[PDB]
Amino acid sequence: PQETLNGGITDMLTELANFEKNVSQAIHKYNAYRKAASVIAKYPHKIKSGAEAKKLPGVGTKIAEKIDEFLATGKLRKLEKIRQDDTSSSINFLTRVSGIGPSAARKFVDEGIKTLEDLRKNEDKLNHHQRIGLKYFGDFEKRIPREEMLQMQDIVLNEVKKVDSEYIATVCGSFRRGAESSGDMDVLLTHPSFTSESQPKLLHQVVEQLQKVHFITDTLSKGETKFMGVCQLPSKNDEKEYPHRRIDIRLIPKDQYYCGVLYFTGSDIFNKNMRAHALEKGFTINEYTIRPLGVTGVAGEPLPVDSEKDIFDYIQWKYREPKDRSE
DNA sequence: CCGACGGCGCATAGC
DNA sequence: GCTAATGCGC
DNA sequence: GTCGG
Ligand code: NA
Ligand code: NA
Ligand code: NA
Numbered sequence: 001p002q003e004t005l006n007g008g009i010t011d012m013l014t015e016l017a018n019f020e021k022n023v024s025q026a027i028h029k030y031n032a033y034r035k036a037a038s039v040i041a042k043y044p045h046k047i048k049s050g051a052e053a054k055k056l057p058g059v060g061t062k063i064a065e066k067i068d069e070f071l072a073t074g075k076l077r078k079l080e081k082i083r084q085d086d087t088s089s090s091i092n093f094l095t096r097v098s099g100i101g102p103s104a105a106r107k108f109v110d111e112g113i114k115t116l117e118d119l120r121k122n123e124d125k126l127n128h129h130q131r132i133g134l135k136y137f138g139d140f141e142k143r144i145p146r147e148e149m150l151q152m153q154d155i156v157l158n159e160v161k162k163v164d165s166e167y168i169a170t171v172c173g174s175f176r177r178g179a180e181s182s183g184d185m186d187v188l189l190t191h192p193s194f195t196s197e198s199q200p201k202l203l204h205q206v207v208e209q210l211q212k213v214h215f216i217t218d219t220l221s222k223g224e225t226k227f228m229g230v231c232q233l234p235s236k237n238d239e240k241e242y243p244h245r246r247i248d249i250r251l252i253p254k255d256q257y258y259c260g261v262l263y264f265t266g267s268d269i270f271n272k273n274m275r276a277h278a279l280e281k282g283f284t285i286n287e288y289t290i291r292p293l294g295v296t297g298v299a300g301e302p303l304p305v306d307s308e309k310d311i312f313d314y315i316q317w318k319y320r321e322p323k324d325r326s327e
Numbered sequence: 328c329c330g331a332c333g334g335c336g337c338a339t340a341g342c
Numbered sequence: 343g344c345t346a347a348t349g350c351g352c
Numbered sequence: 353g354t355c356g357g
Contacts, residue, residue: 020353
């Protein structure tokens with residue numbers, strides 16, 4: 001595919017997607033359009049007919065019709081209607097602020113808060129996460145070029161070991177799959193001292209150190225097992241300050257670690273095939289454990305997992321190195 | 328025809 | 343003050 | 353909005 005073959009169609013379906021998510025608050029109609037929008041992108045021909053697309057899975061009748069209209073006219077009536085009604089547009093803008101969902105945004109626009117300008121006028125009417133989201137509105141929409149992730153992975157891995165020798169940490173997401181760009185940094189942490197049958201100072205002490213290295217600037221949310229905040233790579237006094245980046249850090253028990261690493265490395269399509277393969281061979285996978293399925297469809301106690309490779313060794317698959325996990 | 332569609336950690340009215 | 347429901351992001 | 357029981 002080329003992101004250029006059917007760009008018009010996928011842009012449209014993605015426009016309709018966020019409209020259902022952010023304005024109409026129909027989150028299943030949002031996923032439907034994305035599903036639709038994402039399988040069209042992977043089609044290696046310029047679509048010529050609505051029906052030609054309906055063949056694909058997740059493109060149904062109404063999406064074919066709007067594709068017919070789009071190729072026939074070059075715009076969507078519905079989409080132009082939406083584009084100019086200004087409630088919809090403003091609600092749509094505001095939900096780009098992290099911490100502003102469809103509910104807050106709708107309420108803001110209700111009382112006439114519709115621009116970033118308006119939001120900083122009223123930073124009192126904003127909770128903490130939203131203020132942070134407002135402060136970094138630009139930086140958060142930016143891509144993180146792989147080469148940055150590398151040097152970031154460096155600071156978090158190196159300084160986590162300056163804390164406890166037995167912590168093990170793994171950046172995941174697209175970055176562990178070899179992707180040239182990442183949207184944020186997702187870290188996965190564990191410690192031998194942390195079981196299912198389980199210190200609550202475990203995730204804190206890493207964030208505490210990572211805050212001394214002047215790496216982590218701001219905290220969106222922090223608890224015993226999930227942290228969500230903002231890091232920034234260091235500028236070498238040469239007047240080019242790196243953009244602030246979104247980082248999460250999960251603390252997971254080691255007996256569920258590599259299931260955590262395997263899930264949160266994905267990819268998404270990859271997982272439903274690995275599950276469904278695993279399901280079709282006596283076992284069942286989730287983020288936490290791999291369990292055997294009896295003749296009844298009833299699952300047993302979770303199997304031991306010491307390496308990510310152990311998962312494939314149960315289900316009789318051969319280890320995929322992450323680079324090849326895009327489906 | 329018609330329900331499912333992901334489920335869960337953290338921050339933030341009702342009693 | 344305590345509990346559970348909800349928005350939000352992932 | 354689309355899929356499938
Ligand atoms: Na179809
Ligand atoms: Na948002
Ligand atoms: Na958003």
